Amino acid sequence: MENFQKVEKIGEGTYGVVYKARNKLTGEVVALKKIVPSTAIREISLLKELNHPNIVKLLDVIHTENKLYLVFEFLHQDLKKFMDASALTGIPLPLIKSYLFQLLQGLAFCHSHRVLHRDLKPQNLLINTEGAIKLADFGLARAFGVPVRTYTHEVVTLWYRAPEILLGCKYYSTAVDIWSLGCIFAEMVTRRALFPGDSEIDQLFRIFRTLGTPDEVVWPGVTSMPDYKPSFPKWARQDFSKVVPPLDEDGRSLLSQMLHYDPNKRISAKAALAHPFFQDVTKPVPHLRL
């Protein structure tokens, strides 16, 4: 840590305080995350080779005195801040599309190397002035476990959690990131979170109230998951035209496939890249205030 000069405390991520810092020798500006058992060091260290334009680069892993600091590429704004700034107007559809498309490429790449994010949320999607969007914290939950409470004991968000995770599946897959991204896609479009649960049961029931209570007809095997209860209220599914009204039928069709209950049929990132919604995808530049 003597190689850096902390400029400002960017905020509090899942694992600790995130800082804006400057490398004392090179003068590079980086984001430094304060977070070790050997396993987690080997795993994180493997994440230093997982480079992609739509993945926030892990620059270095600093372990000093039982303290672990992750050094990432610095981006200029996170997506939550950008949506908050875009609230009265909403993010233009062509930019929403470019962003979805890029994030689907970042997920396709990590998922081809069998790496999952598991905790995708607007705060860990980072954007720059050239129109790029990148995922931060890729592969960290498997590396260290995503806590219930953060370092400040900030509530860990459940809003983007896939239903197989909430239902107790222990071996869930790369489909959980597609579910999260579909929720983030919905939120960009409507300017409201899709499923803002404030507890695990509320998260699930908000899901069930909009997509219908899952059963063996739409999700084979769901009735045998660990936390599934036959006493769940049985709600009817809602139309997607009511869920993300703004969106055209191609977008609603892709979102519906990203929010399939059954993880095995949920659309994969690579297959989502070929959906017709992306036929006229472009790369607009956001309007940023840094």
Ligand X SMILES: Nc1nc(N)c(N=O)c(OCC2CCCCC2)n1
What does the binding site for ligand X look like in residue numbers (CB under 6 A)?
A: 10-11, 13, 18, 31, 56, 72-76, 78, 123, 126, 136
- 222 Cβ neighbours under 8 A, 6+ residues apart: 167, 214, 215, 216, 228, 261, 262
Closer residue to ligand X in complex, CB, 10/218? 10
CA dist 162 and 283 (Å) reads 29
Residue 10 beta carbon to ligand X: minimum distance, rounded to whole angstroms:
5
Give all strands (DSSP E) within 55-199, no chain letters: 58-64, 67-73, 77-78, 125-127, 133-135
Residue 79 beta carbon to ligand X: minimum distance, rounded to whole angstroms:
9
Residue 277 beta carbon to ligand X: minimum distance, rounded to whole angstroms:
28
> Is 281 labeled as ligand-binding?
no
Closer residue to ligand X in complex, CB, 140/175? 140
Closer residue to ligand X in complex, CB, 20/237? 20
Residue 143 beta carbon to ligand X: minimum distance, rounded to whole angstroms:
15
> Is 10 labeled as ligand-binding?
yes
- 54 Cβ neighbours under 8 A, 6+ residues apart: 102, 103, 105, 106, 109, 132, 133, 134, 135
> Is 15 labeled as ligand-binding?
yes
CA dist 44 and 30 (Å) reads 18
> Is 139 labeled as ligand-binding?
no
Nearest residue to ligand X by CB is 136
- 211 Cβ neighbours under 8 A, 6+ residues apart: 237, 238, 259, 261
Residue 268 DSSP class: P
Residue 33 CA, distance from chain mean position? 17
Positions marked active-site = 119
> Is 187 labeled as ligand-binding?
no
Closer residue to ligand X in complex, CB, 74/109? 74
Binding site listing for ATP: 10-18, 33, 73-75, 78, 121-124, 137
Binding site listing: 10-18, 33, 73-75, 78, 121-124, 137
